[PDB]
Amino acid sequence: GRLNEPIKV
Amino acid sequence: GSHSMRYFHTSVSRPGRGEPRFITVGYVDDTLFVRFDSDAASPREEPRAPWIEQEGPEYWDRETQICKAKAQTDREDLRTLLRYYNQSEAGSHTLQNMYGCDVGPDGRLLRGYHQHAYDGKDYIALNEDLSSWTAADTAAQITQRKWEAARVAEQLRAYLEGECVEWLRRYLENGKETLQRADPPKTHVTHHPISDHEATLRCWALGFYPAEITLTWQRDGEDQTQDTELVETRPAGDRTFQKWAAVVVPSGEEQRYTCHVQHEGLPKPLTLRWEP
C-alpha cells in the first residue's frame, strides 16, 4: 500500500 | 529470504499535447502487482498479481485517490523544476520517484528509500538514516531546504518503518505460493562455429525467478570477465527471467571452459561444460 503524504519539490 | 516492495512513478511533459502523462507501478521483489496510467480511459489503480485481487474496494479507492493526487503534484513539480533550472516551457521533461523498503527473512526493516530524478539525473534522495537528504545540485538544495523546514523526512521514516514493512509482510503471506518460491534456472551450453579457427560457447539460464543470477565463464579455472559477452537479464513474459553469457573459444579448447551458475533456487552453484 502506498504512502499518502503529499510532497512537492 | 529477504524481500522488497517498491513503487515507481514517472511523469513526462508534452507541451502542446495536453498535460503530462503519469505512470506508476508497484513491485514486490521482481513481481509487478499494481499499475496506474493517467492516459487510461477511466484511470484507476489496477491489480496485476492474483494475491492483490483480494483487497477490497476500500483499498482500491484509497490507492486510486493517492495515484490521482500524485499525478497532480507531479504536474506542479514539473512546473517548479522549469523555474529551478531556468528552462523554457517548450520542451518535454521527465520526473521520476521511487520509494519503498527492504526487509530480511524475519520481516524486519533492512532499509528504506525515497528518491527523485529530473531529466534522468539524480535530484534528491533520502539517506539511509531516513533523516537527512542528499541533493545533487543547487536546485535540489532549494527542495532540501523546503523539506527540512516541513520535516518531510520524519513523515517518510514513519511510513517506511511502519506501513511499508507491514504491507510487505501481508503481501508476502497472501502471495506465499509465488512470492516465496524461487524457480531455479534451466541451464545448457550451446556451440556456434564462427570460422575454422574458433566457435562461440553460450551458457544459458532460462525460466528462473527472482531475476538476480550470476553466470560466468572460466578457462583453466580463471574468470574470463573481459572476454565474456553477458546480456542483460531479460523477462520471458511468464514471470521468469532469462540470461546468457558467451565466449569465443579457439578450436579444440572447449573442454577447458566451464560455465558457473549461482541462483537462490539452486542449493549449490552449478558447473557446466559443452557436451558434444
Binding site: - | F8, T94, G120
Partner: protein
C-alpha cells in the same frame, strides 16, 4: 539534456520449435528519455496488436519496456524488432536469431 540509447534484445519466451506456438519478445532497456517506438516485424512487415508493459525504470533511472506477441516460428519466416529513439539517426532493426 542527457540521452542514453536503448539496449535491444529480441528473443522467444521458450526455445524455438518450428510449428509450435510461442511468444516473441523485444526488450528495450537502459534508455533515456522514455519516448520510444517499437515494432515487431514478420517478413519485414509490422505485426498488428502487439502488447507492451507499463513504463518502469532501473536503479540507475534508465527506462525499460517489453513488447510481445504470440507467434509460431517456422524454418523460413523472418522476425525482427524495429526501434526508434531520439539517440538513433535511423531506426534500428535487430533480427530474431533463435540461438540468442
Amino acid at each position: 539534456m542527457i540521452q542514453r540509447t536503448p539496449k535491444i534484445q529480441v528473443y522467444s519466451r521458450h526455445p524455438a520449435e518450428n510449428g509450435k506456438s510461442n511468444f516473441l519478445n523485444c526488450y528495450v532497456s537502459g534508455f533515456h528519455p522514455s519516448d520510444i517506438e517499437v515494432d515487431l516485424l514478420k517478413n519485414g512487415e509490422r505485426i498488428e496488436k502487439v502488447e507492451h508493459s507499463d513504463l518502469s525504470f532501473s536503479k540507475d533511472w534508465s527506462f525499460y519496456l517489453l513488447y510481445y506477441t504470440e507467434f509460431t516460428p517456422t524454418e523460413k519466416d523472418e522476425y525482427a524488432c524495429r526501434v526508434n529513439h531520439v539517440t538513433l539517426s535511423q531506426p534500428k532493426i535487430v533480427k530474431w536469431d533463435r540461438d540468442m
